[PDB]
Amino acid sequence: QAEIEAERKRAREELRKQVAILAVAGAEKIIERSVDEAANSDIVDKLVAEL
Amino acid sequence: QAEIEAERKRAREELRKQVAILAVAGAEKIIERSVDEAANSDIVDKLVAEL
Amino acid sequence: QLNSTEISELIKQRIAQFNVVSEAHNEGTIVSVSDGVIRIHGLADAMQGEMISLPGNRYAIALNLERDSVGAVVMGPYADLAEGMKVKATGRILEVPVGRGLLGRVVNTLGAPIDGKGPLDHDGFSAVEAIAPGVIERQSVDQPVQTGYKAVDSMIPIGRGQRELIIGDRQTGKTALAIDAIINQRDSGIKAIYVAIGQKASTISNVVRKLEEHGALANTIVVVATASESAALQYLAPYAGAAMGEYFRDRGEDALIIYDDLSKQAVAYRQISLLLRRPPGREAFPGDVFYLHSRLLERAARVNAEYVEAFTKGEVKGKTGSLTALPIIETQAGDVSAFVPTNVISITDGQIFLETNLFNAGIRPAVNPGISVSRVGGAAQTKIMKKLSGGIRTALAQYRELAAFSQFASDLDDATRNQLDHGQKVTELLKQKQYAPMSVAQQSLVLFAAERGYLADVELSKIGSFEAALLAYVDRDHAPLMQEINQTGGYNDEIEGKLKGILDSFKATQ
Amino acid sequence: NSTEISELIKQRIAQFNVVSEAHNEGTIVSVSDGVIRIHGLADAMQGEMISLPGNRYAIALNLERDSVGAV
Amino acid sequence: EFITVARPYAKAAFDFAVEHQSVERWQDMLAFAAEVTKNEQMAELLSGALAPETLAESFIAVAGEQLDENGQNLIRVMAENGRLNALPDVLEQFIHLRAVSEATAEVDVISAAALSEQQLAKISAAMEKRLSRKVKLNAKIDKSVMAGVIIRAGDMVIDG
Amino acid sequence: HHHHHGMATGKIVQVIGAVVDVEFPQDAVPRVYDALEVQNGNERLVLEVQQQLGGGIVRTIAMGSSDGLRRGLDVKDLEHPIEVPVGKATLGRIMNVLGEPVDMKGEIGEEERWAIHRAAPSYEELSNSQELLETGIKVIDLMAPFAKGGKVGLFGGAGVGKTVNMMELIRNIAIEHSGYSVFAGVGERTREGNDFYHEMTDSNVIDKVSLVYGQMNEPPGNRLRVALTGLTMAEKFRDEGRDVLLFVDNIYRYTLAGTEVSALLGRMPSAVGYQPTLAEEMGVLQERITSTKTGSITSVQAVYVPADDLTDPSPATTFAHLDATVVLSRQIASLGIYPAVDPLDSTSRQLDPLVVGQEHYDTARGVQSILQRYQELKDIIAILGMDELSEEDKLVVARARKIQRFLSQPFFVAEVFTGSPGKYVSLKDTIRGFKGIMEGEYDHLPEQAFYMVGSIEEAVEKAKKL
Ligand SMILES: Nc1ncnc2c1ncn2[C@@H]1O[C@H](COP(=O)(O)OP(=O)(O)OP(=O)(O)O)[C@@H](O)[C@H]1O
């Protein structure tokens, strides 16, 4: 039972790498659905600059 | 021991739902800009149209 | 990265978009909030008891309609908030998933997988409380059990549909004994339920430790309610079980449940009632327990096909809704003067007194026999179990009858000496551990002493425990046919030959 | 209690000034099970047993001021 | 403030008053009465008074007695009752008497307030917003409305 | 129904509880009993006014539950409570506790919407009189006398053949007695009630009594309701002259029932919160049951044991509601005799010494001496070798074997069950045949000859069979 733990930890760590990696996409789709639910008009000019 | 890593999946992916949660959090900020950027009292007259 | 697509998916989900609405409230004013009891106004007449999802989600179910006057509550933290806040109204009380999916699934009392399970295996949504099945919708199932004591069955076998009280002992195990129960049940891997309120996280934890220790641990599920579970919620869990419990009983499967600490639901209704500033029954709780346990206590439905709609309705499912009820009876001193213990006591289809004495002086099985009285009984004891089950009350008499002889110092007779040989020595026979399973192939093991010469054979408690265990050896030696026996579970003398020659192996087994 | 009237408070608009109903018979005020708040019968005699409509002399012991309760 | 005692009041108000048409006439008289208790010395002196006769006395008396005789002998009625202690209950219940009698109204959502009397729904309502003109909703105009649909939206941001 | 044409009422003021905090058509109030039948959501609501209180605002209550509705309302006033189709047509046909067609439509014969309120007669009306009773049970109606048109306390544990003997009551109250034999019950086990429909086929004679059942989950009013409509029924049977004799289920259900009642009142209830007047309801009760002029108004008295209470203000009342005391013997069931129950503690009150005078003061009182005879002959003479005991003590043991065997007798029940025919018995053949025979005559009559054998021609002519 002891061993598997450390590996699982590494897995979550990669989830952190890909997590920060995902931060990008979250900024992207972030502004995206921002315009969608804006549902009034979309000015992408304003830069939220979300991470 | 295996079930442990299983929880590393439920929790790993769970955190994926977390950074999801924060993700459209910051998105929700971008939509605050989407009211800031490109809002129209014309659209308000479209709600007036919803009368 | 990985879950980024989910955002789109969420975006997909959130694709449903939104609108503003309900130009006219559609809402109240929660006039004076006091500790979640809100003097409240606005949006008045409605479904009574409507849980009205207030700030946060809090869905305040208040069935108290004064003419014109509102006040309301829902379980939760009302301390910081202020009065008057417009009443945010969900239409009513709710339903958590209705399905048989859970198996041994784990959660908060809401079904919130407070295990962190996240697990939801149930269909749809299930509102809580329900009535029993009608004539021949409930119809007696005799399905027995030998529960981990041989005597477990032996005293009173039973079947689906049944509710028997067992009085219980504080700090005696009668929770840990009450724990010691589940042995055959986890072994049963059959449909049952259990409930707890105000629970203790340690007991929770170590309990779980046993759960894995319990082979099954999934054979049945329970949601969990802790020391903060609302006096409301306290009242709620009993209501709760039926919700998807149908997905057995309605499934025509045996539903089966366990409720305990019912007092928590009662004085729950007390600090409710005094909190309600409402005159309750004695002990500050309303006498609803009759109705509360009329509605509550009704449900148990033994398998019967005027459940002809049970589950599929009926896509047959024309079939036998089985609901076996699991009571938990305990009190300090076990006080029946409780109107709860009074009327409730009446409803019991069995009443077992637990004696603190045995496990008190330490005899592991502690319970109070014949003070323990259950109506179901060894009807469910199968032909041999049916057969061999007789002499019990005898030594309950006899041994205890033998006991009476001591009352005069040096009063005994060799005959009576035999009534302490059977009475007291055969008394020396029985035991059930702190953790006792029961074999029910052990049914034979029972029928030995009379059937075998085991009345005499290895009469020494040294040889009873010892040499008997050495007969468990003789099973090691010879236990070929027990296959066909526990297979059988019935009285046939043909076996009984093998019972005598068995006793010969017992000579060999000493 | 008093406000119940609103019709004899409609009266009482004048008929708090306007007045003078004293009689051995004012209305049974409140009927539940032979206990009626009751009117008139101003000074009435000892537990005065009041021959009741289709019924026995009805007794009210100590004068309940507003509407005498009855037996 | 029970207003239920004052319910029997406003009852007798539309009833005897409107019967006397004092619903308006002792809307006037009544008005002057709420003016009387409104007098804070008359509040400061409101109740020390054992004789309620003294109260209706110095009350109609003090204030100028614009109450009707329905309200003077009624002044005996409620004053004597001492339920006169609460003036406004049946005042807004009388406002509810004549008004409830006359009721037509509106409520502005996502808007600065409306209250355009609509005997029917959408009757003067859709006639008002359509009639807007106003159309601004200024108070609740945008952040309130756009935060209404967007309120449901953030409600979808529950997904986080 | 009555009126309640017009929907009446108005709001339910403070919506709490089945009793009405309710605006009726405020001037409108009926008799508190006089019902008010609303629409309950979908359902038509109804409440007999629990309170008579003005403003159309009075408690008006029902056995159901209120959640979900508006405080607003209007509730038609059923000018009559109590009037529900009632008469003797119901017999055998299943009435709900509502009288509703309980079964597939049990269709207990729809009859007079008939007031439940049928009650006590004039001093003379139902019998200023005394009316004795027996149906000729093989060893039993002989054993105890009885008074017609009434109820008598029943104490016995198990194995009664109460359904069997009920078939003997079918074979009697239906057969060996004509008088209309009705019965009712409440608070049973579901498919075991259905199994009392099985038994209802066992007797098969179920047609004598409408099927109306409580199923104890029935609320307290629901639980406590059916009786007075039962008097709208004996308002046939006894009133129909076909003497109403109806079997009576449950006291504990009724005792505790009235408890839950006065509790719900919140009133100063009876002691321990019970129904204060539940006993007065017994005055109304026996007030209902009399061997009547009309027809004997009779009832089978057996109690859901109000916990089998000690000194039991119920048994206190059920004593003197027992003309005959009762016991059932698992021991005579251990004797297993066709007489399988406890004659001990079972006899009519005044039978032996007077009121039969010698007739039972000799046959039956002297018979009780014989109860001492096999009592200490069987018992005492059993203590050690009975050689000491005169063979009379062993002919009190042929009172046991021989005579007590004669007690074992076929049953009109056992006919209706096992075929063992049984009879309306003649205690002459007891007062003589079993008294003389059991005592001195034909003491050679075998136990078996006597055993499972009826009156001394069946026991003693079975002694011709020996
Ligand atoms: N059959 C048994 N024989 C001996 N000891 C037992 C048995 N069952 C439980 N116990 C003991 O009881 C102890 C735990 O006490 P526990 O609090 O469960 O007592 P309790 O009887 O449960 O009190 P309550 O029933 O009120 O909780 C454990 O140490 C356990 O060994």
Task: Please state the length of chain F.
Answer: 466
Pairwise CB contact (< 8 Å): E142 & B22: no
Q: Give which of F91, F82, F111, F154 is closest to F303, Cα–Cα.
A: F154
Q: What is the resolution of this structure in A?
A: 7.8
Pairing of strands F211-212, F112-114: unpaired
Q: Which of E 107-146 lie inside 8 A of C, CB atoms?
A: 107, 109-110, 145
Is F162 one of the catalytic residues?
A: yes
- The closest alpha carbon to C192, from C325, C374, C381, C377, belongs to C325
* Whether the Cβ atoms of residue F126 and residue F293 lie closer than 8 Å to each other: yes
Give the pair of three-digit tokens for residue C326: 């699991």
Is D9 close to E74, i.e. CB distance below 8 A? yes
Compute the distance between CA of residue F360 and CA of residue F352 in angstroms, rounded to an integer: 4
Which residue, F424, F392, F411, F415, is CA-closest to F453? Answer: F411
Q: How many CA atoms lie within 13 A of C92 on its CB side?
A: 9
The residues pairing with F36 across neighbouring beta strands, listed in sequence order, are F47
Question: Which has the closest alpha carbon to C488: C446, C444, C456?
Answer: C444
Q: Report the alpha-carbon distance of residue F238 to residue F295 in Å, rounded.
A: 4
Task: Round the CA-based radius of gyration of chain B to a whole number and report it.
Answer: 20
Q: Is C169 labeled as ligand-binding? A: yes
Q: What is the DSSP string of C460-499?
A: SHHHHHHHHHHHHHHHHHS-STHHHHHHH-S--HHHHHHH
Which residues, 6 or more positions from C160, have their beta carbon under 8 angstroms from its beta carbon? C140, C141, C143, C254, C256, C302, C303, C322, C323, C324
- The tokens for F73 are 């309302």
| Beta strand pairing call for C106-108 and C222-224 | parallel
On the 0-12 / 13-18 / 19+ scale of CB atoms within 10 A, D53 is exposed
> Could you tell me how many CB contacts below 8 A there are between chain D and chain E?
64
Measuring CA to CA, which residue among E91, E82, E81 is closest to residue E35? E91
Tell me the CA–centroid distance for residue C213 and ligand 1, in Å: 18
Q: Per the CB < 8 Å rule, is C16 touching E151?
A: no
List chain C residues with CB under 8 Å of E145: 20
Ligand 1 lined by C169 (C-beta under 6 Å): yes
Q: How many CB atoms lie within 10 A of CB D23?
A: 10
Count of CB atoms within 10 A of residue C414's CB?
A: 8
CB-neighbour burial class of residue F416 (10 A; exposed 0-12, middle 13-18, buried 19+): buried
Q: Tell me the CA distances in angstroms from A4 to A9, A12, B12, F155, one per residue in order.
A: 9, 13, 15, 72
Q: Is E21 left (phi over 0), alpha (psi -120 to 50) or beta?
A: left
| Residue closest to F192 by CA, chosen among C377, C347, C140, C308 | C140
> Are F159 and F330 in contact, with CB atoms under 8 Å apart?
yes
Assess contact for C263 and C293: CB atoms under 8 A. Answer: no
Looking at the complex, does the CB of residue C118 fall below 8 Å from at least one CB of chain B?
yes
With a 6 Å cutoff on the Cβ, whether C207 touches ligand 1 is: no
User: Does the beta carbon of C356 sit less than 6 angstroms from any atom of ligand 1?
Assistant: no
Residues of C marked as catalytic:
375
3-state secondary structure D18-50: CCCCCCCCCCEEEEECCEEEECCCCCCCCCCCE
| Concatenated DSSP letters of F164-218 | HHHHHHIIIIIIIS-S-EEEE--S--HHHHHHHHHHHHHT-GGGGS-EE---TTS
- Name, in order, each residue with C-beta under 8 angstroms of B19's C-beta and a sequence gap of 6 or more: A19, A22, A23, A26, C3
Paired tokens of E77: 């009625």
**CA nearest ligand 1 atom 28, residue:** C173
Contact check, Cβ <8 Å, C20/E152: yes
Distance from CA of A43 to the nearest CA of C (A): 19
Chain C CB within 8 Å of residue E150 CB: yes
Could you tell me the distance, in angstroms and rounded to a whole number, from the CA of residue C365 to the centre of ligand 1? 10
- Could you give the CA distance from residue F405 to residue F448 in angstroms, rounded to a whole number? 6
CA of F400 to the centre of ligand 1 (A): 53
Considering only CA atoms, which of F24, F5, F21 is closest in space to residue F13? Answer: F21
Q: Under a CB-based contact definition with an 8 Å cutoff, are residues F298 and F150 in contact?
A: yes
**Which experimental approach was used here?**
cryo-EM
In short, whether C261's Cβ falls inside 6 Å of ligand 1 is no
Structure tokens at F312: 């039991």
C111 phi-psi bin (left φ>0, alpha ψ -120 to 50, beta other): left
Q: Which residues of D touch F54 (CB under 8 A)?
A: 30-31
- The token pair that represents E13 in the structure block: 């108000």
Question: Do the Cβ atoms of F287 and F299 come closer than 8 Å?
Answer: no
Interface residue F53 vs chain D (CB under 8 A): yes
Of F59, F162, F171, F293, which residue is the catalytic one? F162
Rounded to 5, what percent of chain E is helix, strand, coil?
60, 0, 40
Say which residue the tokens 């130009």 belong to.
Answer: C23
SS3 content of chain D, % helix, strand, coil (to 5): 10, 20, 70
Task: Find tokens 């006395």 and name the residue.
Answer: E57
> Other CB atoms closer than 10 Å to residue F258's CB: what's the count?
24
- Cβ-based burial of D65 (10 A; exposed 0-12, middle 13-18, buried ≥19): exposed
Sequence letter at residue F211: L
Ligand 1 centroid from CA C108, angstroms: 26
Chains A and B touch (3+ CB pairs under 8 A): yes
DSSP code string of B1-51: -HHHHHHHHHHHHHHHHHHHHHHHHHHHHHHHHHHHTT--HHHHHHHHHT-
C239 vs C235: CA distance, rounded Å = 7
CA distance F162 to F415: 14
Residue D40 to residue F46: CA distance in whole angstroms: 36
Instruction: Tally the C-alpha atoms within 13 A of residue F193's C-alpha that lie toward its C-beta.
Output: 25
C-beta of residue C221 within 8 angstroms of C-beta of residue C178 = no
Tokens representing C391? 């002499």
CA C304, CA C124: separation in Å to the nearest integer?
Answer: 26
| Region for residue E3 given its phi and psi (left: phi exceeds 0; alpha: psi -120 to 50; beta: otherwise) | left
How many residues are present in chain C? 510
Asked whether the beta carbons of F267 and F261 are under 8 A apart, the reply is no
Paired tokens of C508: 């060999």
Which residues are bridge partners to F58 per DSSP?
Answer: none
Give me the amino acid identity at F460: V
Hey, is D51 helix, strand or coil? strand
Residue C78 in contact with residue C22, Cβ under 8 Å? no
Q: Which two tokens stand for residue F140?
A: 């039993």
What 3-state class would DSSP assign to E87? coil
Tokens linked to D71 = 């037996």
Contact C353, C334 (CB under 8 A): yes
Q: What are the residues whose beta carbons fall under 8 Å from the beta carbon of C253, sequence distance 6 or more?
A: C100, C191, C247, C311, C322
Q: Which of F48, F42, F77 is nearest to F60 (CA)?
A: F48
Task: Give the Cα-Cα-Cα angle F73, F77, F79 (nearest 5 degrees).
Answer: 175
C-alpha distances in Å from residue D1, one per residue of E73, F175, F376: 19, 63, 76
* CA-wise closest residue to C80 among C62, C56, C49: C56
How many Å lie between the centroid of ligand 1 and the Cα of residue F430?
A: 62
Chains touching chain D at 3 or more Cβ pairs under 8 angstroms?
E, F
The contacts of residue E103 (CB under 8 Å, 6+ apart) are none
Q: For residue C20, give the nearest of E107, E145, E157 by CB distance.
A: E145
CB contacts, 8 Å: B51 with chain E: 126, 129-130
* Residue F294 to residue F149: CA distance in whole angstroms: 11
User: How would DSSP label each residue in F346-401?
Assistant: -EESSTTTTTSTHHHHHHHHHHHHHHHHHHHHHTHHHHS-TTSS-HHHHHSHHIII
* CA geometry: angle C423, C425, C427, nearest 5 deg: 60
Q: Are F186 and F224 in contact (CB under 8 A)?
A: no
In degrees, rounded to 5, the angle at the alpha carbon of residue C496 between the alpha carbons of residues C492 and C499 is 145
Q: How far is CA C40 from CA C37, C82, C83, in A?
A: 9, 12, 8
Other CB atoms within 10 Å distance of the CB of residue C410: 6
Instruction: Write down all domains in chain F, each with its CATH number in brackets.
Output: 9-81 (2.40.10.170), 82-350 (3.40.50.300), 351-466 (1.10.1140.10)
Q: Which residues of C touch B24 (CB under 8 A)?
A: 7, 10-11, 14
Any idea which residue has 């009592």 for tokens? F375
What does the alpha-carbon distance between residue F216 and residue F204 come to, in Å, rounded to a whole number? Answer: 25
The region that residue F110 occupies, defined by phi over 0 for left and psi between -120 and 50 for alpha, beta otherwise, is: beta
